[PDB]
Amino acid sequence: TNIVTLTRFVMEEGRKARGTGEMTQLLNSLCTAVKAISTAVRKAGIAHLYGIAGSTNVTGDQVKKLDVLSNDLVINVLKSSFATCVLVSEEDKNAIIVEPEKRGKYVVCFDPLDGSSNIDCLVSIGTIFGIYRKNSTDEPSEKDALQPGRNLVAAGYALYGSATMLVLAMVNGVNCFMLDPAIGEFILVDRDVKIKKKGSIYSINEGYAKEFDPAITEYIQRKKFPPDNSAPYGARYVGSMVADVHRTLVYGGIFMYPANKKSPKGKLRLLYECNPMAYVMEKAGGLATTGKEAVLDIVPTDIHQRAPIILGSPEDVTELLEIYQKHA
Ligand SMILES: O=P(O)(O)OC[C@H]1O[C@](O)(CO)[C@@H](O)[C@@H]1O
Ligand SMILES: [Mg+2]
Ligand SMILES: [Mg+2]
Numbered sequence: 001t002n003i004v005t006l007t008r009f010v011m012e013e014g015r016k017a018r019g020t021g022e023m024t025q026l027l028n029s030l031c032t033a034v035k036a037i038s039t040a041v042r043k044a045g046i047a048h049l050y051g052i053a054g055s056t057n058v059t060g061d062q063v064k065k066l067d068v069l070s071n072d073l074v075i076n077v078l079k080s081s082f083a084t085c086v087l088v089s090e091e092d093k094n095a096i097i098v099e100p101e102k103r104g105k106y107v108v109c110f111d112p113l114d115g116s117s118n119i120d121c122l123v124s125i126g127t128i129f130g131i132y133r134k135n136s137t138d139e140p141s142e143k144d145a146l147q148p149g150r151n152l153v154a155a156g157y158a159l160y161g162s163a164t165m166l167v168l169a170m171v172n173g174v175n176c177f178m179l180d181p182a183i184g185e186f187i188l189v190d191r192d193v194k195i196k197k198k199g200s201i202y203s204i205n206e207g208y209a210k211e212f213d214p215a216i217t218e219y220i221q222r223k224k225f226p227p228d229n230s231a232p233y234g235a236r237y238v239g240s241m242v243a244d245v246h247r248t249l250v251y252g253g254i255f256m257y258p259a260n261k262k263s264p265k266g267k268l269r270l271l272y273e274c275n276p277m278a279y280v281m282e283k284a285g286g287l288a289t290t291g292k293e294a295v296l297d298i299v300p301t302d303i304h305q306r307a308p309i310i311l312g313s314p315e316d317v318t319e320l321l322e323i324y325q326k327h328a
């Protein structure tokens with residue numbers, strides 16, 4: 001009879017500092033969209049929700065029916081939250097400017113459904129988000145979203161896996177909240193999460209081996225044939241960034257979506273995939289790098305810009321950084 005919900009947690013966090021309560025409103029609103037997306041995902045084949053929507057988005061994906069439903073759900077709850085002023089979504093070509101009567105102080109970048117290729121085979125999928133405070137006095141605009149990830153005030157993701165989890169990072173750390181399907185509340189289940197200094201799992205799509213740079217090539221070979229005769233690392237690649245990053249957080253190890261000979265900036269999108277996961281990882285004591293610089297320090301120039309990303313346990317990411325340095 002004492003439920004420690006995400007709302008309660010975010011309200012006491014706001015308690016400390018000076019707060020207007022907007023961030024609690026924003027996150028309460030997002031939790032409503034996440035529950036509605038989870039329920040749709042959990043019965044998607046009965047509700048006929050698998051399959052395509054009939055379009056392609058700005059970064060070239062085939063749009064799915066669940067992309068359109070999830071996107072509409074998040075845009076509508078954020079607008080109605082009275083906490084936001086600019087929204088960037090994977091699924092919209094341009095930033096969405098909230099109407100004056102509904103504006104609040106925050107800028108939200110999100111991936112309404114991550115793991116597209118895994119939808120129809122029932123593999124874990126998720127929602128990713130990053131929140132900034134608006135920086136200017138100027139009329140809100142797309143440029144308010146073009147901040148480096150270091151300016152995030154909150155970021156995280158929802159994982160629609162064997163259970164639904166909301167992982168939320170803010171200035172003093174990372175906490176995990178599980179959806180209780182019977183009462184429709186996110187309950188705190190893991191407090192102040194910290195990643196292990198060194199793991200034993202590497203996560204990359206090795207189908208790209210022909211295109212990898214020499215540093216990734218060398219690192220993968222080291223994980224399979226360690227020079228010190230330690231046990232080789234195990235390999236995991238679920239193929240949904242939210243699921244592979246969440247395993248990296250709770251088990252340690254490394255996740256990689258690097259630049260390659262065909263994709264100089266990688267595949268994943270900086271504003272609503274890479275920066276939120278880099279922020280979570282740094283708040284959990286991990287690292288997130290392109291191979292040459294910190295993901296959170298990149299100043300974006302395009303809301304749909306791509307970035308390479310290597311993240312996870314700091315000793316594993318540092319070992320790969322040392323290989324890039326060796327090869328530069
Ligand atoms: O099939 P690939 O090239 O390994 O891409 C998988 C990646 O693409 C995405 O689906 C893009 O959202 C990620 O969730 C996942 O990490
Ligand atoms: Mg997509
Ligand atoms: Mg995605």
Ligand SMILES: [Mg+2]
Pocket residue numbers: 090111112113114115116
């Ligand atoms: Mg997506």
